[PDB]
Amino acid sequence: SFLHVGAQLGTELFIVRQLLQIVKQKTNQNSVDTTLKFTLSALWNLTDESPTTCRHFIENQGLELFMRVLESFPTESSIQQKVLGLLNNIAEVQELHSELMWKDFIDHISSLLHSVEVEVSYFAAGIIAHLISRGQAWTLSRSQRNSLLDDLHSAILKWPTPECEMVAYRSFNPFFPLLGCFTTPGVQLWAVWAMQHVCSKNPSRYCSMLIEEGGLQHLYNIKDHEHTDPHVQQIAVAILDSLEKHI
Amino acid sequence: SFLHVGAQLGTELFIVRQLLQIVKQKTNQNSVDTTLKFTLSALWNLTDESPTTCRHFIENQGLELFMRVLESFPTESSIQQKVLGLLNNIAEVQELHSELMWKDFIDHISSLLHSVEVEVSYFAAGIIAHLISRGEQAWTLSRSQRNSLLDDLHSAILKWPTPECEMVAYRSFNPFFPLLGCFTTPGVQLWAVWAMQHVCSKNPSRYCSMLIEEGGLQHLYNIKDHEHTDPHVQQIAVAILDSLE
């Protein structure tokens, strides 16, 4: 049983509010705790493919609090990873691209792109790619826009093969618009690198999902559009020549 | 994106633990805040049709905490309602039966069984019905209290006025159907059909079609043509049927 019909969304948003409360309080104590990491993971999971909870997170000034946690734990790679994963989920929601147009946020993301932990800079790069995705809606410095595109492209190619699988996905759909951005080599470079990574680590899961959602097409279109970045093209053909073996 | 595969289960159980922490906090303080009852509703909803988070609730001392909530706020309508609703969700899980066989627990539930605010006695009755529905040997406590409760349940339901606004909601009637077959213990049957009738009379657009699609017509109707059935139970059952037509 439960209280009444439709009562679960209210409790979901209430849970988001209370998790933000625990984040704020653990930040005030400077307590990198097991419960703090669990709370950041919970927030990250709840924002997965749910723009309503992303909007509730933003409307409860969650991103300001996440800037604060980034600044109060500058060396904690796990904290940064979970924070940036949630912020990536937000960067995927087009209706809220407006409220990530804030230079303190963009500055912290650009700084975290140069982390020597690929588990951190990967999500920094994802945020960056999904923000440059929108052509300009830029609302800020075009200096910083061009700078961060170039930095995206360089940083991706400086990445090693990760040890674990740094992330999970239930759908490759948010990657498909980033694959058509032939104008922005870094964005599709991040997309192709991430898909390659997840199928290389977990083919059992993501090969079937990548083919079923029609992504082999986006890859094949990149394959011989002659206005393609050699690096993006090489990653695309590698993904194809691995996904072709698996039916 | 999310942390890793299967992380959603860990996140949900962590949420259960933290909500229980908020409950213990606002019970140590005698603070009946908005967030306390919202936490109670959140826990209640998370326990709906999910044996897993109910098991986690029990494993995180949730039973003792909830009865501390009961003993510290004996006048609070919504608080007792939500507590007893979550415990009703626990009671429908057979594997956790032995956990609810606590003496003080059954005592408090039998006390709240006789409360006149139906929003409370209803869920207390649900707990007791599900408990003694599982047989005599399964009752590891005072059998005197068991065979007294299967009468006090019957009596408490007959004295019930019909509720006003939304008291409860269900996603499926499947936990009720095993109760409908307890001809040996007619209080269980009577609670089951009374609940079905109430929810089908206030929200017929949802619940009667749900009841038919889940095949409850056949159980109510078995009660119909099963002779030697309790007269109150039979009355309510044929009543549900005659407009389920």
Q: Which residues of A touch B166 (CB under 8 A)?
A: 3-5
Query: What is the Cα–Cα distance from A33 to A78, expressed in whole angstroms?
Result: 11
The DSSP code sequence of B175-241 is: TTHHHHT-TTSHHHHHHHHHHHHHHHHH-HHHHHHHHHHTTHHHHHHHHHH-SS--HHHHHHHHHHH
For residue A45, give the nearest of B8, B82, B171 by CB distance.
Answer: B8
* Interface residue A22 vs chain B (CB under 8 A): yes
Query: What is the Cα–Cα distance from B104 to B110, expressed in whole angstroms?
Result: 10
Query: What is the Cα–Cα distance from A203 to B36, expressed in whole angstroms?
Result: 45
Do B44 and A3 count as a contact with CB atoms less than 8 A apart? yes
Query: What is the Cα–Cα distance from B57 to B86, expressed in whole angstroms?
Result: 10
The DSSP code sequence of B155-168 is: HHHHTPPPP-S---
Cβ neighbour number for residue A112 with a 10 Å cutoff: 23
Q: Give the pair of three-digit tokens for residue B52.
A: 């897993």
Specify the CATH number for A7-244; select among 1.25.10.10, 3.10.20.340, 1.10.150.120, 3.40.630.10: 1.25.10.10
Chain breaks in chain A (C to N over 2.5 A) after: 135
Give the resolution to one decimal, in Å: 2.5
Instruction: Say if CB A113 and CB A155 are below 8 A apart.
Output: yes
Residue from B3, B44, B84, B122 whose CB has the most chain A CBs within 10 Å, to mutate: B3
Q: Put residue B50 in one of left, alpha, beta given phi > 0 → left and psi -120 to 50 → alpha.
A: beta
| Maximum Cα–Cα distance across chain A | 59
Q: Which residues of A touch B7 (CB under 8 A)?
A: 41, 45, 168
Place of tokens 């995180």: B60
Instruction: Give the torsion sign (CA, B59, B63, B65, B66).
Output: positive
Q: Which residues of B touch A167 (CB under 8 A)?
A: 1-4
Query: What is the Cα–Cα distance from B50 to B64, expressed in whole angstroms?
Result: 20
Query: How many residues are listed for chain B in this entry?
Result: 245
Q: How was this structure determined?
A: X-ray
In B34-93, the residues whose Cβ lies within 8 Å of chain A are 35, 38-39, 41-42, 44-46, 48, 82, 85, 88-89
Q: How far is B26 from chain A (nearest CA, A)?
A: 14
Query: What is the Cα–Cα distance from A239 to B158, expressed in whole angstroms?
Result: 69
Q: Give the pair of three-digit tokens for residue A109.
A: 């993301």
Q: Which residues of A touch B10 (CB under 8 A)?
A: 38, 41
Instruction: Say if CB A151 and CB A110 are below 8 A apart.
Output: yes
Query: What is the Cα–Cα distance from A50 to A121, expressed in whole angstroms?
Result: 23
Instruction: Say if CB B178 and CB B133 are below 8 A apart.
Output: yes
* Interface residue B136 vs chain A (CB under 8 A): no
Q: Give the pair of three-digit tokens for residue A219.
A: 């890859």
Strand partners, B2: A168
Query: What is the Cα–Cα distance from B1 to A226, expressed in whole angstroms?
Result: 32
B243, exposed or middle or buried, with CB in 10 Å at 0-12, 13-18, 19+? Answer: exposed
Q: Give the pair of three-digit tokens for residue B136.
A: 């005599």
Residue type present at position B27 = T
* Angle made by CA atoms B169, B172, B173, in degrees to the nearest 5: 95
| Nearest by Cα to A135 from A178, A87, A99, A190 | A178
Q: Where are the domains of chain B?
A: 7-244
> How many helices and strands (H and E) does chain B possess?
14, 0
